[PDB]
Amino acid sequence: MNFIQYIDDSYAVKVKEINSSEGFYINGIQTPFFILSVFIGNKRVTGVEFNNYDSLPMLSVINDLGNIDLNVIPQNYFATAFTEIYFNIPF
């Protein structure tokens, strides 16, 4: 079970599954979102990156393992809705 934890526009934590066909990709959020964490095989992974989307803040948030505070990230870093994001997980 591969799934991502992300916050919507209203700063609410939600979980969405990942489609593993022809790679790892996510789409159809329907709202501005900021990806928080990625889980592959019911475990937390680090060192992931996007091969088509350039965004340092989400990479920095994902790669850190400790608990984070949602009061430090502004609305600027939020990605636009209906965005196709691909994952490159090391293995």
Author numbering: 1 to 91
According to the publication:
Following the approach applied to the MCPs, we calculated a localized reconstruction of the internal part of ΦCjT23 spike (penton domain), in addition to the FLiP penton base from our previously published data. The resolutions of the localized reconstructions for ΦCjT23 and FLiP were 3.4 and 4.0 Å, respectively. In contrast to FLiP, the entire spike of ΦCjT23 is made by one protein, P13 (283 residues), which forms both the capsid-internal and capsid-external parts, analogously to the spike protein of phage PM212. The capsid-integral part of the spike, corresponding to the P13 N-terminal penton base domain (residues M1–F91), sits in a slightly raised position relative to the type 1 MCP trimers circling it. The penton base domain is a small β-barrel (SBB) with a β-strand topology that differs from the topologies of better-characterized SBBs29, and from the canonical β-sandwich fold observed in pentons of other viruses such as FLiP and Bamfordvirae members. The ΦCjT23 spike SBB is formed by anti-parallel β-strands β1, β2, and β4, and additional β-strands β3, β5, and β6. The region connecting strands β5 and β6 include a short α-helix (S55–D64) and a long loop (L65–F78). The α-helix resides at the monomer–monomer interface. Part of the loop (L65–N71) faces toward the central cavity of the pentamer. Together the five loops close an oculus in the middle of the pentamer.
In this study, we report a detailed characterization of ΦCjT23, an icosahedral temperate ssDNA phage with an inner lipid membrane, isolated earlier from a strain of Flavobacterium (previously Cytophaga). The minimalistic structure of ΦCjT23 suggests that this phage serves as a model for the last common ancestor between ssDNA and dsDNA viruses in the Bamfordvirae. Both ΦCjT23 and the related phage FLiP infect Flavobacterium species found in several environments, suggesting that these types of viruses have a global distribution and a shared evolutionary origin.
